[PDB]
Structure 1
Amino acid sequence: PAVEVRLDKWLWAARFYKTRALAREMIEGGKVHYNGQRSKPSKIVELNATLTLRQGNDERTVIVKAITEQRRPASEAALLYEETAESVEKREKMALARKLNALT
């Protein structure tokens, strides 16, 4: 089955975490959810799955659009998923509010 890529490898390939070991720690900390639930490092990624993950102190919800074992460049990896519009908005709004409480 050459259509089986682990969630920890995937998260690293997609550049969400610097190393697979870190991606594995985040998963085990419950900081990454797969279709709304705790997952595991060895979970095989499926196209269109919904992943919710912690980025520093940001939360992003992305939909898996491609699977690969290669970690490509910044702009290139970024193409293995599509962040949801609701996720981008939530992030923005929190960022804005941050900059607001700042100018006050």
Structure 2
Amino acid sequence: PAVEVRLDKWLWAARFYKTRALAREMIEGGKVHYNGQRSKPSKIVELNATLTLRQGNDERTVIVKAITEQRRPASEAALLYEETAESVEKREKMALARKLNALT
């Protein structure tokens, strides 16, 4: 089955975490959810799955659009998923509010 890529490898390939070991720690900390639930490092990624993950102190919800074992460049990897519009908005709004409480 050459259509089986682990969630920890995937998260690293998609550049969400610097190393697979870190991606594995985040998963085990419950900081990454797969279709709304705790997952595991060895979970095989499926196209269109919904992943919710912690980025520093940001939360992003992305939909898996491609699977690969290669970690490509910044702009290139970024193409293995599509962040949801609701996720981008939530992030923005929190960022804005941050900059607001700042100018006050």
Asked if TM exceeds 0.5, the reply is yes
1:33-78 deviation digits (Å, cap 9, x = unpaired): 0000000000000000000000000000000000000000000000
Structure 1 residue 11 displacement after superposition: 0.0
Residues 1-104 of structure 1 aligned to structure 2 (within 5 Å): 1-104=1-104
**SS of aligned partner of 2:60:** strand
**SS of aligned partner of 1:12:** helix
Query: In 2, Cα distance between the equivalents of 1:13 and 1:91?
Result: 22
Query: In 2, Cα distance between the equivalents of 1:82 and 1:9?
Result: 18
% identical equivalent positions: 100
Query: In 2, Cα distance between the equivalents of 1:65 and 1:10?
Result: 12
Structure 1 residue 25 displacement after superposition: 0.0
Segments of 5+ residues of structure 1 without an aligned counterpart are none
Aligned residues: 104
TM-score between both structures, scaled by the size of structure 2? 1.00
Structure 1 residue 24 displacement after superposition: 0.0
Query: In 2, Cα distance between the equivalents of 1:97 and 1:16?
Result: 24
Segments of 5+ residues of structure 2 without an aligned counterpart are none
1:14-36 deviation digits (Å, cap 9, x = unpaired): 00000000000000000000000
Query: In 2, Cα distance between the equivalents of 1:35 and 1:102?
Result: 35
CA RMSD of aligned residues (A): 0.0
TM-score between both structures, scaled by the size of structure 1? 1.00
